[PDB]
Amino acid sequence: EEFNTGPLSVLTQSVKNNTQVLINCRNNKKLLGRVKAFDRHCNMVLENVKEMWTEVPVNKDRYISKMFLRGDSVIVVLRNPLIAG
Amino acid sequence: MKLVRFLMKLSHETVTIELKNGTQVHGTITGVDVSMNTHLKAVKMTLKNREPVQLETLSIRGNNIRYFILPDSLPLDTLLV
Amino acid sequence: LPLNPKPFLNGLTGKPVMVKLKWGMEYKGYLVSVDGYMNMQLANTEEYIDGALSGHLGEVLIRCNNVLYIRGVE
Amino acid sequence: DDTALIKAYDKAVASFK
Amino acid sequence: EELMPRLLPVTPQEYLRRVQIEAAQCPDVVVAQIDPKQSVNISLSGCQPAPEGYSPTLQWQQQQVAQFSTVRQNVNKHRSHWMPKSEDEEGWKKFCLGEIGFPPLLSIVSRMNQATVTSVLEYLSNWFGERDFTPELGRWLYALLACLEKPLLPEAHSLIRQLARRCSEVRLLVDSKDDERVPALNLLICLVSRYFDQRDLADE
Amino acid sequence: ELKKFMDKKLSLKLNGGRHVQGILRGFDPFMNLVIDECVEMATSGNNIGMVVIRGNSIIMLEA
Amino acid sequence: MVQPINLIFRYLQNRSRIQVWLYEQVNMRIEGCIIGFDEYMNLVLDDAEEIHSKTKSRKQLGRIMLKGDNITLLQSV
Fold this sequence. Notes:
Strand content of chain E: under 5%
Number of domains of chain A: 1
Protein name (chain D): Survival motor neuron protein
Number of helices of chain A: 1
CATH class of chain A: Mainly Beta
CATH architecture of chain A: Roll
Number of strands of chain A: 6
Helix content of chain E: 40-55%
Subcellular location (chain D): Nucleus, Gem; Nucleus, Cajal body; Cytoplasm; Cytoplasmic granule
Structural class of chain E: mainly alpha
Largest sheet of chain A: 5 strands, antiparallel
Oligomer: heteroheptamer
Order of helices and strands of chain E: HEEHHHHHHH
Largest sheet of chain E: none
GO molecular function, one term (chain G): RNA binding
Family (chain D): Belongs to the SMN family.
Helix content of chain A: 10-25%
Strand order of the largest sheet of chain A: 4-3-2-1-5
Shape of chain E: elongated
Distance between the termini of chain A: 37 Å
Radius of gyration of chain E: 27 Å
Shape of chain A: globular
Family (chain G): Belongs to the snRNP Sm proteins family.
Number of helices of chain E: 8
Number of domains of chain E: 1
């Protein structure tokens, strides 16, 4: 219904199409991964997450296979992010 | 929020938790409450500039949690039902 | 004729907005969609950090709670 | 055996078959 | 907990009902359609896959992962019975690798605290960016890895990943299996990728 | 209970290390207050009149 | 007894210019005239400005909707 439309469709697209999203986290870090499930609070079960950040001005990252993310930590979520190596 | 119902199914799984201060807390789940308060045992805490800390038990406020690193082997599809 | 919060929001959909966050970043985009919690969907999104354009994010969901204020843009 | 590590590493390299 | 908490109790109370009343008649979700350009986010690389025939077998990987565990249990013993300064990039490089330099005795690595281990991994990785992979470098890397206590700081995870990268890059300069580096490089990548959970970097 | 702070003076600590000195004039179930004749005790503090204070933010509140 | 909703309501009727102390921000306050609000304390604010601190600068916002969970304190101006 209105998971289907309404802002939470961004999330239900990744579930439907196994698409990665990029999440800006209150961390000051970014998470790139596939969504497994989510709730209205944007609590999240993620897979294959790449956590990425910069700091001393060097890019940093880490991999987390399986994550539960509290919706609390999420700031913005990009549908169809664009990343490069 | 349905998804905590998931965390509630995780007793005895050992997890690592990132706190909002950035601490990492490894431990085994005795229980998770409906507000995400998590009780751990056999705990190790890694801190930015302080040696690790071992604790027999610890319990952490749901709103101090940024995320749970789950065990790779965890089977998500059965837990999500 | 008081203009109340939900009407004014519903009033902004389909239009250019600047959404500003409790963390100081702001996002300019066309407000595609809104829900009852005031989660927002923007399209053609531009992020500003320090008021300096930082990225073109395309489509983007913003979690309600991070919002400081929303406003109409020309 | 204070060089258990150095030892540990050589064994590990050597096991490469 | 509460996405949008009620801050005001329900005259003003008369007004607030009018508002609550009106809002409930406002549509919950509203989608506008738009009648008819993306930036890049800088992602670090993966590992460079091994040149054909250089990729180790799983059983060897699992073996090392399994072996390494046991080796780590030993390291705790020594660290139970109780060097350059921590900030000295130049001393630490010199101390470990020399000109020789000190091997990693338990007597030493056991003494170092976790911030230092991490510091030294960084320094030895920087050297590595800029000099060749000897066997001396290899044991230190193994030793430091063995001394790192989990769970790891994210900063520590990033550092060991860069190191696995560097290893996978150096692994392409090789032109025979008999090259002394091959086993060591395969090991360090295998440890980082399997032991320390960075499975996106693993040789498969 | 807040019943008997009413018309009594106080000083308030607010989130973000913010302090406020004033006399309680009203309140509600959600912990919001009205404070009269309030001063923001900045670093270098201003008399800012009647104010509403949100129930959270209010970290410490003493007399 | 002055109940807070009364006061807030008073500002609306008069259309007083108010200054809002932000919860997560101490280096900025928001200034405006309030033309609507609700039980979440969300405020539709007319002719709003961002008043920054130590820089003595004001930015015209226009009409904005300000979320209630942002509010620490409300004062007139």
